[PDB]
């Protein structure tokens, strides 16, 4: 199309699609029940992202929100993606460490709150209030990060969890910043650059994260 | 009303309602925990369908989508039904065979993708792109069917699973065809006939499927 | 704002926010896995309510629905809250009594139906039909109440469950009445009083319920 961000949406669609196919093929033949869980979660994540990238590319997942006296292009489909994919990603971490159910519920619920309030902020027509939602969403993210560090095994489990926790902190923490400087927030970075940034983050957080996880012996039960 | 498809919506509402009441009464008194799971899942399915049929009958679950240069009546409430009822139905099959959690997640997630992309296709304003969504949704359905045949007990469990798997393949595979030839897709069959077809499919896939399942000794633990 | 109900929305936001913070601090340090489940569920409930109260206060969670020949202010965000918080509350009760999974699914599903049909009724443009949805929603509520009394331990578990079941029946049963007499239904009580009533009910059903639950020894495994 003639939205300059189309190229990043197209590459995102492609990389999510290819990552989905790769993980699908890779998990073919896996019989270990524990490993199956990780393959399922980890393949579902970019498959969902693929659909939502495509919806943005085709224009379905874009709406105009009036605020600051303009009609502002907001890609709402990102939140529909994140609503499902972010708890899934947290579930991969939580299963790695054999987290308590209470802890999993805390994580999933805080994540739901993070995404839902981010969506509310994204669609809010009173400019100043958009940042209230951003702050609440960010608080939920900080709670999530706190639990990953202070709320929790085989040495390979510890090692893989540590690496993935670090990837998670670094990549996830960038999202509120991009939103804040981008078209959803202060509008200091144009939508095409914002789209590029989220594409790099998303591909790393999904396909990159998944490559790290699915390469590890941590996803298998200890078997002779 | 004066929408000619009202009669099929009314009969669908009635048959789902009656099926719900029948399963409710039938599962009264069931104490076996395994059987309770099947009664719960299986009664919930037509209860949800009853609500969404009624919403279509009353006109709430209908919207107009512009495409191909017309205002096209799209019953969106079907997807709200299917979003919940189709994974529930898959859950009945998966519990019958004591499926791995990874496999259940794969099934539920692929199903979510099937329904969500079908909804996107149903609401998409660019005619040609509607069929892209249809294709992606169909791929998700084919993945689901593949898992039911290649991804998986007491002989009565095997026997009941086999029958229900066959019912599932035959009925579910008809949905993409009806959508394709109907008002959502190529518009070769009118909405009133499309509605009739989905009504027959839905009642069979829910109340018919449920009668088969709930009549079986497979839903009970092996007890003396 | 100049909506007279703003004061009740503001106090609701505050009390849910404070209740969230209190439960969060209170559950700090809890290591018992069973207790963690209850703290997680019970803190998530007012955290979600806090977000949805704030959304109503800020005006995001309000829409106008034409019916009875007027444009009627309907707070839809209540349903988005209840959709998540009501099954969570039922989950607290069900975990207390170690409910069968079938029973939990029945409860959660009936609750989903209660809330979804209440939302449909709230948004329905044909006045008389709003009450059809109300009736169906009420039937789902009555099913839920029936299960809590007829569908189900350590003496402290029994004692706490009994108290919380009674609180639940009394408070939950008031909701259909308020809706019926309020702006969503017959319009005999003005929106500002309706808002006050739901605020008192919600705070009691969430923060009050939670204080009772989290003060009990019932939420802990039996340990030496
Ligand atoms: C698609 C997959 C192939 C895996 C093969 C193995 C073996 C940064 C990404 C963006 C800009 C381009 C990141 C990570 C890798 C993503 C691929
Ligand atoms: C409603 C139930 C009664 C069950 C009694 C037993 C005993 C095809 C359906 C449509 C067109 C009419 C199908 C299956 C049965 C559905 C009833
Ligand atoms: C916020 C919490 C503090 C708990 C401290 C303990 C110790 C009726 C409510 C409304 C009108 C005001 C009710 C229940 C208590 C809610 C607080
Ligand atoms: C695969 C995609 C992922 C891992 C996306 C993660 C996204 C977030 C952590 C987003 C966080 C946000 C906030 C913390 C504040 C408001 C804006 C959001 C939703 C971008
Ligand atoms: C009770 C209702 C059920 C079992 C409905 C099943 C529906 C489907 C399998 C629908 C599939 C579709 C596609 C595969 C492609 C696009 C259109 C859909 C959603 C009708
Ligand atoms: C924390 C909030 C809670 C516990 C809310 C409970 C709400 C209900 C039990 C609402 C019930 C309703 C009906 C039974 C009929 C239609 C209207 C509703 C949704 C208010």
mmCIF file of C-alpha atoms in Angstrom, chain B:
data_model
loop_
_atom_site.group_PDB
_atom_site.id
_atom_site.type_symbol
_atom_site.label_atom_id
_atom_site.label_comp_id
_atom_site.label_asym_id
_atom_site.label_seq_id
_atom_site.Cartn_x
_atom_site.Cartn_y
_atom_site.Cartn_z
ATOM 1 C CA UNK B 1 -39.500 -11.025 11.171
ATOM 2 C CA UNK B 2 -39.381 -10.326 7.484
ATOM 3 C CA UNK B 3 -35.846 -11.695 6.984
ATOM 4 C CA UNK B 4 -36.629 -14.922 5.226
ATOM 5 C CA UNK B 5 -33.935 -16.759 7.225
ATOM 6 C CA UNK B 6 -35.856 -16.063 10.489
ATOM 7 C CA UNK B 7 -37.485 -19.533 10.352
ATOM 8 C CA UNK B 8 -34.114 -21.310 10.447
ATOM 9 C CA UNK B 9 -32.892 -19.010 13.209
ATOM 10 C CA UNK B 10 -36.083 -19.759 15.194
ATOM 11 C CA UNK B 11 -35.782 -23.521 14.734
ATOM 12 C CA UNK B 12 -32.083 -23.335 15.629
ATOM 13 C CA UNK B 13 -32.895 -21.419 18.770
ATOM 14 C CA UNK B 14 -35.550 -23.972 19.708
ATOM 15 C CA UNK B 15 -33.456 -27.065 19.021
ATOM 16 C CA UNK B 16 -30.436 -25.681 20.888
ATOM 17 C CA UNK B 17 -32.690 -24.688 23.780
ATOM 18 C CA UNK B 18 -34.355 -28.085 23.916
ATOM 19 C CA UNK B 19 -31.006 -29.861 23.592
ATOM 20 C CA UNK B 20 -29.651 -27.787 26.486
ATOM 21 C CA UNK B 21 -32.619 -28.665 28.701
ATOM 22 C CA UNK B 22 -32.371 -32.339 27.763
ATOM 23 C CA UNK B 23 -28.643 -32.592 28.582
ATOM 24 C CA UNK B 24 -29.186 -30.615 31.816
ATOM 25 C CA UNK B 25 -31.875 -33.002 33.027
ATOM 26 C CA UNK B 26 -29.915 -36.022 31.835
ATOM 27 C CA UNK B 27 -26.787 -35.083 33.780
ATOM 28 C CA UNK B 28 -28.748 -34.543 36.971
ATOM 29 C CA UNK B 29 -27.518 -36.947 39.544
ATOM 30 C CA UNK B 30 -24.264 -37.843 37.816
ATOM 31 C CA UNK B 31 -21.559 -38.209 40.511
ATOM 32 C CA UNK B 32 -18.661 -39.676 38.600
ATOM 33 C CA UNK B 33 -16.104 -36.814 38.199
ATOM 34 C CA UNK B 34 -15.085 -37.864 34.724
ATOM 35 C CA UNK B 35 -18.728 -38.035 33.529
ATOM 36 C CA UNK B 36 -19.418 -34.657 35.132
ATOM 37 C CA UNK B 37 -16.719 -33.123 32.950
ATOM 38 C CA UNK B 38 -18.344 -34.463 29.813
ATOM 39 C CA UNK B 39 -21.855 -33.415 30.893
ATOM 40 C CA UNK B 40 -20.609 -29.951 31.753
ATOM 41 C CA UNK B 41 -18.777 -29.396 28.490
ATOM 42 C CA UNK B 42 -21.540 -31.003 26.459
ATOM 43 C CA UNK B 43 -24.436 -29.081 28.034
ATOM 44 C CA UNK B 44 -22.540 -25.776 27.861
ATOM 45 C CA UNK B 45 -22.104 -26.141 24.097
ATOM 46 C CA UNK B 46 -25.773 -25.937 23.070
ATOM 47 C CA UNK B 47 -26.521 -23.452 25.885
ATOM 48 C CA UNK B 48 -24.063 -21.020 24.303
ATOM 49 C CA UNK B 49 -25.428 -21.786 20.836
ATOM 50 C CA UNK B 50 -28.970 -21.163 22.115
ATOM 51 C CA UNK B 51 -27.965 -17.660 23.204
ATOM 52 C CA UNK B 52 -26.264 -16.848 19.935
ATOM 53 C CA UNK B 53 -29.094 -18.263 17.800
ATOM 54 C CA UNK B 54 -31.507 -16.129 19.784
ATOM 55 C CA UNK B 55 -29.290 -13.104 19.264
ATOM 56 C CA UNK B 56 -29.418 -13.705 15.493
ATOM 57 C CA UNK B 57 -33.174 -14.280 15.564
ATOM 58 C CA UNK B 58 -33.733 -10.961 17.441
ATOM 59 C CA UNK B 59 -31.365 -9.146 15.071
ATOM 60 C CA UNK B 60 -28.682 -8.267 17.604
ATOM 61 C CA UNK B 61 -26.096 -10.592 16.114
ATOM 62 C CA UNK B 62 -26.396 -9.234 12.570
ATOM 63 C CA UNK B 63 -24.348 -6.423 11.037
ATOM 64 C CA UNK B 64 -24.003 -4.957 7.528
ATOM 65 C CA UNK B 65 -20.568 -5.211 5.879
ATOM 66 C CA UNK B 66 -19.829 -3.188 2.706
ATOM 67 C CA UNK B 67 -18.043 -5.183 0.081
ATOM 68 C CA UNK B 68 -18.467 -5.908 -3.577
ATOM 69 C CA UNK B 69 -20.305 -2.608 -3.665
ATOM 70 C CA UNK B 70 -23.256 -3.719 -1.563
ATOM 71 C CA UNK B 71 -24.284 -3.657 2.101
ATOM 72 C CA UNK B 72 -24.041 -7.331 3.027
ATOM 73 C CA UNK B 73 -25.894 -8.861 6.067
ATOM 74 C CA UNK B 74 -23.276 -10.768 8.084
ATOM 75 C CA UNK B 75 -24.326 -12.714 11.165
ATOM 76 C CA UNK B 76 -21.324 -12.061 13.383
ATOM 77 C CA UNK B 77 -22.846 -13.818 16.373
ATOM 78 C CA UNK B 78 -22.002 -17.157 14.789
ATOM 79 C CA UNK B 79 -18.306 -16.481 15.518
ATOM 80 C CA UNK B 80 -18.967 -15.499 19.113
ATOM 81 C CA UNK B 81 -20.709 -18.887 19.484
ATOM 82 C CA UNK B 82 -18.025 -20.858 17.676
ATOM 83 C CA UNK B 83 -15.231 -19.098 19.533
ATOM 84 C CA UNK B 84 -16.369 -20.881 22.714
ATOM 85 C CA UNK B 85 -18.199 -23.919 21.470
ATOM 86 C CA UNK B 86 -15.670 -25.295 19.032
ATOM 87 C CA UNK B 87 -12.801 -25.571 21.536
ATOM 88 C CA UNK B 88 -15.276 -27.077 24.010
ATOM 89 C CA UNK B 89 -16.175 -29.751 21.465
ATOM 90 C CA UNK B 90 -12.466 -30.432 20.865
ATOM 91 C CA UNK B 91 -12.029 -30.639 24.630
ATOM 92 C CA UNK B 92 -14.635 -33.459 24.747
ATOM 93 C CA UNK B 93 -12.615 -35.386 22.187
ATOM 94 C CA UNK B 94 -9.317 -34.677 23.887
ATOM 95 C CA UNK B 95 -10.606 -35.735 27.307
ATOM 96 C CA UNK B 96 -12.002 -38.958 25.867
ATOM 97 C CA UNK B 97 -8.517 -39.985 24.760
ATOM 98 C CA UNK B 98 -6.664 -38.541 27.723
ATOM 99 C CA UNK B 99 -4.733 -36.192 25.401
ATOM 100 C CA UNK B 100 -1.433 -34.600 26.461
ATOM 101 C CA UNK B 101 -1.785 -30.992 27.616
ATOM 102 C CA UNK B 102 0.487 -29.868 24.782
ATOM 103 C CA UNK B 103 -1.889 -31.438 22.295
ATOM 104 C CA UNK B 104 -4.938 -29.844 23.936
ATOM 105 C CA UNK B 105 -3.227 -26.433 23.760
ATOM 106 C CA UNK B 106 -2.351 -27.012 20.072
ATOM 107 C CA UNK B 107 -5.977 -27.918 19.340
ATOM 108 C CA UNK B 108 -7.545 -25.059 21.292
ATOM 109 C CA UNK B 109 -5.100 -22.546 19.885
ATOM 110 C CA UNK B 110 -5.478 -23.675 16.278
ATOM 111 C CA UNK B 111 -9.238 -23.550 16.814
ATOM 112 C CA UNK B 112 -9.018 -19.995 18.139
ATOM 113 C CA UNK B 113 -7.081 -19.099 15.057
ATOM 114 C CA UNK B 114 -9.653 -20.846 12.828
ATOM 115 C CA UNK B 115 -12.522 -18.892 14.349
ATOM 116 C CA UNK B 116 -10.757 -15.552 14.713
ATOM 117 C CA UNK B 117 -9.548 -15.537 11.111
ATOM 118 C CA UNK B 118 -12.993 -16.615 9.939
ATOM 119 C CA UNK B 119 -14.418 -13.591 11.799
ATOM 120 C CA UNK B 120 -11.836 -11.301 10.232
ATOM 121 C CA UNK B 121 -12.734 -12.691 6.823
ATOM 122 C CA UNK B 122 -16.439 -12.230 7.549
ATOM 123 C CA UNK B 123 -15.972 -8.533 8.411
ATOM 124 C CA UNK B 124 -13.341 -7.657 5.768
ATOM 125 C CA UNK B 125 -14.369 -4.910 3.349
ATOM 126 C CA UNK B 126 -11.986 -5.768 0.512
ATOM 127 C CA UNK B 127 -13.660 -8.625 -1.294
ATOM 128 C CA UNK B 128 -10.585 -10.540 -2.504
ATOM 129 C CA UNK B 129 -8.980 -10.432 0.910
ATOM 130 C CA UNK B 130 -11.985 -12.167 2.485
ATOM 131 C CA UNK B 131 -10.750 -15.302 0.749
ATOM 132 C CA UNK B 132 -7.227 -14.947 2.104
ATOM 133 C CA UNK B 133 -8.710 -15.170 5.622
ATOM 134 C CA UNK B 134 -10.866 -18.099 4.522
ATOM 135 C CA UNK B 135 -7.743 -19.920 3.327
ATOM 136 C CA UNK B 136 -5.826 -19.294 6.537
ATOM 137 C CA UNK B 137 -8.850 -20.370 8.601
ATOM 138 C CA UNK B 138 -9.162 -23.496 6.465
ATOM 139 C CA UNK B 139 -5.466 -24.277 7.008
ATOM 140 C CA UNK B 140 -6.092 -24.097 10.766
ATOM 141 C CA UNK B 141 -9.040 -26.455 10.352
ATOM 142 C CA UNK B 142 -6.910 -28.882 8.375
ATOM 143 C CA UNK B 143 -4.292 -28.799 11.150
ATOM 144 C CA UNK B 144 -7.017 -29.612 13.643
ATOM 145 C CA UNK B 145 -8.282 -32.524 11.532
ATOM 146 C CA UNK B 146 -4.680 -33.770 11.128
ATOM 147 C CA UNK B 147 -4.173 -33.849 14.874
ATOM 148 C CA UNK B 148 -7.423 -35.734 15.436
ATOM 149 C CA UNK B 149 -6.137 -38.424 12.996
ATOM 150 C CA UNK B 150 -2.407 -38.408 13.540
ATOM 151 C CA UNK B 151 -1.802 -36.837 16.978
ATOM 152 C CA UNK B 152 -3.240 -39.440 19.387
ATOM 153 C CA UNK B 153 -7.367 -46.624 25.742
ATOM 154 C CA UNK B 154 -10.343 -48.713 26.882
ATOM 155 C CA UNK B 155 -12.065 -50.290 23.876
ATOM 156 C CA UNK B 156 -15.276 -48.268 24.491
ATOM 157 C CA UNK B 157 -13.207 -45.116 24.601
ATOM 158 C CA UNK B 158 -11.618 -46.032 21.255
ATOM 159 C CA UNK B 159 -14.981 -46.873 19.739
ATOM 160 C CA UNK B 160 -16.721 -43.697 20.865
ATOM 161 C CA UNK B 161 -13.761 -41.533 19.922
ATOM 162 C CA UNK B 162 -13.672 -43.061 16.430
ATOM 163 C CA UNK B 163 -17.383 -42.356 15.822
ATOM 164 C CA UNK B 164 -17.176 -38.827 17.175
ATOM 165 C CA UNK B 165 -13.984 -38.095 15.216
ATOM 166 C CA UNK B 166 -15.785 -39.186 12.019
ATOM 167 C CA UNK B 167 -18.840 -37.025 12.814
ATOM 168 C CA UNK B 168 -16.488 -34.164 13.512
ATOM 169 C CA UNK B 169 -14.564 -34.488 10.251
ATOM 170 C CA UNK B 170 -17.688 -34.763 8.146
ATOM 171 C CA UNK B 171 -19.625 -31.930 9.748
ATOM 172 C CA UNK B 172 -16.788 -29.488 10.424
ATOM 173 C CA UNK B 173 -15.408 -29.843 6.882
ATOM 174 C CA UNK B 174 -18.739 -28.631 5.497
ATOM 175 C CA UNK B 175 -18.512 -25.233 7.238
ATOM 176 C CA UNK B 176 -15.764 -23.722 5.010
ATOM 177 C CA UNK B 177 -17.728 -24.852 1.981
ATOM 178 C CA UNK B 178 -20.965 -23.220 3.085
ATOM 179 C CA UNK B 179 -19.090 -20.023 3.944
ATOM 180 C CA UNK B 180 -17.356 -20.036 0.608
ATOM 181 C CA UNK B 181 -20.590 -20.427 -1.483
ATOM 182 C CA UNK B 182 -22.745 -18.342 0.871
ATOM 183 C CA UNK B 183 -23.268 -14.662 1.641
ATOM 184 C CA UNK B 184 -19.911 -14.350 3.403
ATOM 185 C CA UNK B 185 -17.951 -15.609 0.396
ATOM 186 C CA UNK B 186 -18.897 -15.924 -3.279
ATOM 187 C CA UNK B 187 -22.588 -15.244 -2.757
ATOM 188 C CA UNK B 188 -23.820 -18.090 -4.965
ATOM 189 C CA UNK B 189 -26.197 -19.457 -2.327
ATOM 190 C CA UNK B 190 -28.574 -16.902 -0.718
ATOM 191 C CA UNK B 191 -28.437 -16.082 2.968
ATOM 192 C CA UNK B 192 -31.645 -17.942 3.765
ATOM 193 C CA UNK B 193 -30.244 -21.227 2.384
ATOM 194 C CA UNK B 194 -26.859 -20.548 3.987
ATOM 195 C CA UNK B 195 -28.668 -20.110 7.311
ATOM 196 C CA UNK B 196 -30.534 -23.359 6.866
ATOM 197 C CA UNK B 197 -27.294 -25.189 6.144
ATOM 198 C CA UNK B 198 -25.481 -23.807 9.171
ATOM 199 C CA UNK B 199 -28.521 -24.622 11.329
ATOM 200 C CA UNK B 200 -28.498 -28.283 10.267
ATOM 201 C CA UNK B 201 -24.722 -28.479 10.701
ATOM 202 C CA UNK B 202 -24.749 -26.753 14.084
ATOM 203 C CA UNK B 203 -27.577 -28.823 15.546
ATOM 204 C CA UNK B 204 -25.878 -32.011 14.350
ATOM 205 C CA UNK B 205 -22.438 -30.920 15.552
ATOM 206 C CA UNK B 206 -23.739 -29.968 18.971
ATOM 207 C CA UNK B 207 -26.907 -31.798 19.933
ATOM 208 C CA UNK B 208 -26.259 -34.764 17.647
ATOM 209 C CA UNK B 209 -22.611 -35.070 18.728
ATOM 210 C CA UNK B 210 -23.707 -34.684 22.349
ATOM 211 C CA UNK B 211 -26.359 -37.396 22.185
ATOM 212 C CA UNK B 212 -23.741 -39.802 20.822
ATOM 213 C CA UNK B 213 -21.209 -38.850 23.470
ATOM 214 C CA UNK B 214 -23.491 -38.782 26.475
ATOM 215 C CA UNK B 215 -25.050 -42.186 25.565
ATOM 216 C CA UNK B 216 -21.642 -43.866 25.736
ATOM 217 C CA UNK B 217 -20.104 -45.678 28.710
ATOM 218 C CA UNK B 218 -16.839 -44.046 27.616
ATOM 219 C CA UNK B 219 -17.582 -40.936 29.656
ATOM 220 C CA UNK B 220 -17.404 -42.881 32.933
ATOM 221 C CA UNK B 221 -14.322 -43.939 34.834
ATOM 222 C CA UNK B 222 -13.903 -47.679 35.019
ATOM 223 C CA UNK B 223 -15.609 -48.535 38.297
ATOM 224 C CA UNK B 224 -16.804 -51.737 39.917
#
